[PDB]
Amino acid sequence: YTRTQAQHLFIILMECMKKKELITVFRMGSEGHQDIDLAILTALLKGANASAPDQLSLALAWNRVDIARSQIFIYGQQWPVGSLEQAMLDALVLDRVDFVKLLIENGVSMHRFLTISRLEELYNTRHGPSNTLYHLVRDVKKGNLPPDYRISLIDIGLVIEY
Amino acid sequence: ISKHTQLSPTDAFGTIEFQGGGHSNKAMYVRVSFDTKPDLLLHLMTKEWQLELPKLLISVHGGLQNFELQPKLKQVFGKGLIKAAMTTGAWIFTGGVNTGVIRHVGDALKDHASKSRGKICTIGIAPWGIVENQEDLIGRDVVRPYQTMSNPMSKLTVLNSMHSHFILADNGTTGKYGAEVKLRRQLEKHISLQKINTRIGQGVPVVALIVEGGPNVISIVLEYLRDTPPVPVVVCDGSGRASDILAFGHKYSEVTIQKTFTYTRTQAQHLFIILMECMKKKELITVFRMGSEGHQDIDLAILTALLKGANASAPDQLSLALAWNRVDIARSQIFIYGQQWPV
Structure with missing residues (x-):
């Protein structure tokens, strides 16, 4: 393949094998990683060299519930304080019902997560599908709505009553 | 100290709700001293919590x-x-x-x-x-x-x-x-002697299930084997702890050179006397294999270990299988050739 044993790329190959903590090999019918998509995605969680909240955020953004259920939520992960609450809030904003169910199953409870501030933040999101709530708030207030208006829970009460 | 405590009354009982996983489950609970007689415990479990006596x-x-x-x-x-x-x-x-x-x-x-x-x-x-x-x-x-x-x-x-x-x-x-451990063993011993609704004169049958384990699991399985009513035990092989060791030792009934496990104080400290006594009472141990041997289902492996462990006659086995409402167990393990029922 090359100029005999005189010319070789063995130094480059040895350096790559020195950095072998990142290489992932896909083998058909092997012990693990039976599919390419699993092999590609599972090589980014460990390759990020980041914390468990970062892996959870990546799996939430990708909308891959199975990856987080199998490669993230494992025994002994050492979640910091206030991390699963932020993950639940971000999953609630993005309309990821599967991740909400998985987080509820894995410890978090709505009786402690949901406060007044977090609900009022949930009512003022720009992610997810479109809605007609802003038109309702405008119509309840009979117009005269200034731009960049924060929606308070009193407005929600008024629109529910209407 | 030498257990110098205060015998204050209980201050923690009732019902607890588990906020957390996706289930709405209630769980009655109490808090008693570890020197409590089993009679009032069974009275509380039968009257306060309304639990029927088990079969x-x-x-x-x-x-x-x-x-x-x-x-x-x-x-x-x-x-x-x-x-x-x-x-x-x-x-x-x-x-x-x-x-x-x-x-x-x-x-x-x-x-x-x-x-x-x-x-x-x-x-x-x-x-x-x-x-x-x-x-x-x-x-x-x-x-x-x-x-x-x-x-x-x-x-x-x-x-x-x-x-x-x-x-x-x-x-x-x-x-x-x-x-x-003492309270649990005392309660189990007392409930073993409790009379089942069948008027033959037999108590409830007790079985022991072993998964994983440690150094003390051999001691407790010996305590089960040596009890005046012999309590059969069922062990699993795939755990890898002393249950796997006991399953391996079930073979070759009475190779002492296999005592190195990096698990105890070298070859100096051993539980081999306890293990040899447990193997001496080999007739009660039952080992579950994942298809390697018979009884591939542990639901049958548990039930079939109580019929022979009772050391009773065919009418008692039939009464137990009738109380359990398991027709297959009686059809396969009781009604066999040459049982000699009395008149």
Whole structure:
């Protein structure tokens, strides 16, 4: 393949094998990683060299519930304080019902997560599908709505009553 | 100190709600001293909690540390245990805390609850000093919230959910185990002598299930074997702990050079006397294999170990199989060639 044993790329190959903590090999019918998509995605969680909240955020953004259920939520992960609450809030904003169910199953409870501030933040999101709530708030207030208006829970009460 | 405590009255009983995982489960609980007579315990379990007397009792033992099982073994363990405890009206005694084999029992109960009806009376006898929150449960006779999330830095183990009832025993100490073994054994011994509704004169049959384990599991299985009513035990091979050691030692009934495990104080300290006595009482041990031998289902392996362990006649086996409402067991293990029923 090359100029005999005189010319070789063995130094480059040895350096790559020195950095072998990142290489992932896909083998058909092997012990693990039976599919390419699993092999590609599972090589980014460990390759990020980041914390468990970062892996959870990546799996939430990708909308891959199975990856987080199998490669993230494992025994002994050492979640910091206030991390699963932020993950639940971000999953609630993005309309990821599967991740909400998985987080509820894995410890978090709505009786402690949901406060007044977090609900009022949930009512003022720009992610997810479109809605007609802003038109309702405008119509309840009979117009005269200034731009960049924060929606308070009193407005929600008024629109529910209407 | 030499156990210099104060005999104050109880201040923690009622019902607890498990905020956390995706289930709405209630769990009655009390807090009593570890020197309590079994008579009032059974009175409380029969009258206050309204539990009918079981036709079978399964005492589950194991190692008090987290481990892992192969995915093939979990399917043939959890489903079989749930089937055996559900088809036959039975009680399951467990540690109660969320460690080791008890977590496997908990997830086995979780998997069953999403596809079948009925409730399984799982009773946990846990020490009071190891729960995550000794507080938040002081409200007597009132529903108390409980959080399933636990931080590993707290040095305490959270109470396992999916348990029907709890019996908490405190010796006055916190952070150490060993406050419940005597009470659990005394209650099991007393309930073994309790008379079943059949008027033949037999008590409820008690069985022992061993998963994983440690150095003390050989001592407790010897205590089971040496008891005046012999209590059969059932062990599993795929765990890898001393249960696997006992399963390997079941072969070659009475190779002492295989004593090196990096598990005890070298070859100087051994439990080989206890192991040899357990193998001396070999006729009661039952080993479960994943298809290597007969009885590939642990629901049958548990039930078939009580018929021969009773050391009774064919009418008693027939009465037990009739009370359990298991027609297949009586058809296959009782009604066999040459049984010689009396007149």
